[PDB]
């Protein structure tokens, strides 16, 4: 009966989902993420865009608009660890996005 | 600030609220049967024939 230790520090360690495949290639391919300007709001803490630009083409991935994917918002997304020398699956707080390739207008 | 991609991972714990338990009762609590008609006591000839 294999057991952990459950530890939550608090950061967030974004999850990507791809529309068109599984990754199965990692390389040379940029990642950055563009969150909002006020803080006041609770709009800092929510509003995100995930930008993963390859050579051939750039994804972009949102928190708010019409194609961000509802698991983020009915469900909660961790991330464990599992540091198996001490013993503990220490547990972080995670996001998941969905990007889509960026086109035209 | 450059974000990485790590590598896969093993399992998924899912965590959710567990079964009812105490909920039901171990014996069953059916409606009781409508008792049988009985027939009514003081039950007595009232009608004597004439003359």
Same mark, same amino acid.
Not at chain 1, 64 to 69: C, H, Y
Not at chain 1, 83 to 89: A, E, F, L, V, Y
């Given at each position: 009966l294999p057991s952990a230790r459950w530890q939550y520090c608090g950061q967030r360690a974004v999850l990507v989902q791809f529309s068109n495949g599984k990754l199965q290639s990692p390389g040379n391919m940029r990642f950055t993420l563009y969150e909002n300007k006020?803080?006041?709001?609770?709009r800092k803490r929510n509003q995100r865009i995930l930008a993963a630009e390859t050579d051939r083409l750039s994804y972009v991935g949102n928190n708010? +608009?019409? +194609?961000?994917?509802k698991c983020n918002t009915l469900c909660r997304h961790f991330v464990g660890i599992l540091?198996?020398?001490?013993?503990?699956?220490e547990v972080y707080d995670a996001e998941l996005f969905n990007m889509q390739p960026l086109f035209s207008d | 600030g450059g974000l990485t991609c790590a590598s896969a991972p093993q399992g998924t714990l899912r965590i959710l609220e567990g079964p009812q338990q105490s909920?039901?009762?171990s014996p069953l609590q059916p409606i009781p049967a409508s008792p049988p008609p009985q027939i009514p006591?003081?039950? #007595?000839? #009232?009608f004597c024939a004439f003359g």
């Open positions: 006020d803080s006041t709001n609770p708010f +608009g019409t +194609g961000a994917l540091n198996k020398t001490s013993g503990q699956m | 909920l039901s009762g006591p003081g039950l #007595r000839p #009232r």
